[PDB]
């Protein structure tokens, strides 16, 4: 679970101007999209692994 995560050096934040609001909102859309995907998958993955782990031990 840990090793398959691809960790790369990154630069997450981006700056936008007053008239670049659509770009800012797309940048936000991208962050929220990725965040909801990773959050949903991380929560769900852990719950599924926990059910299997407890069943594994039983």
């Amino acid at each position: 679970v840990i090793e398959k995560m691809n960790t790369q050096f990154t630069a997450v934040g981006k700056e936008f101007n007053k008239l670049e609001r659509r770009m800012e909102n797309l940048n936000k859309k991208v962050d929220d999209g990725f965040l909801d995907i990773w959050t949903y998958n991380a929560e769900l993955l852990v719950l599924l692994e926990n059910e299997r782990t407890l069943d594994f031990h039983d």
């Binding site: 050096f9 630069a11 934040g13 700056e15």
Partner: protein, 161 residues
């Protein structure tokens, strides 16, 4: 990875035919009117503001970040006091860059204690290329420039830690 701040256009030898002095109260330092260290405000000398022409060759194996600005007086009297032509422009070109700028003189709401404005512009000069600067007024000249060697992108973080 490397940020060399070098003097691109040495003050004393680069501009002997005009004024390389002049400060603003708005940039005051320790009570004295002042200005930026990497930029030089150019004004006329003894009534003259000659056409300027400068050329920098990038002889380093680095990109060079060149900064400059354009003065935008609040009025005509200010432009005439500093520059002696109303139809002022500056021009900056390189093998793959070209911009022409003119002042926009207007009354503006004050910011700090100023009515006029200075716009800031920049370009990255690739190794082996050249930047040619021209002006007949309103030039804030590059004085220092940075020879850059860029690393893997990282970021600007805001924190008081």
């Amino acid at each position: 990875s490397s940020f060399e701040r070098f003097e691109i256009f040495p003050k004393e030898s680069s501009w002997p035919n005009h004024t390389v002095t002049g400060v603003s109260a708005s940039c005051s330092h320790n009570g004295k009117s002042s200005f930026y260290r990497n930029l030089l405000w150019l004004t006329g000398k003894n009534g003259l503001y000659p056409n300027l022409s400068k050329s920098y060759v990038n002889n380093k194996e680095k990109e060079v970040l060149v900064l400059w600005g354009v003065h935008h007086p609040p009025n005509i009297g200010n432009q005439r006091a500093l520059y002696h032509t109303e139809n002022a422009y500056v021009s900056v070109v390189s093998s793959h860059y070209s911009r022409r700028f003119t002042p926009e003189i207007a009354k503006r709401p004050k910011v700090r204690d100023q009515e006029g404005r200075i716009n800031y512009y920049w370009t990255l000069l690739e190794p082996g290329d050249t930047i040619i600067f021209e002006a007949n007024g309103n030039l804030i000249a590059p004085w220092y420039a940075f020879a850059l060697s860029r690393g893997f992108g990282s970021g600007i973080i805001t924190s008081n830690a």
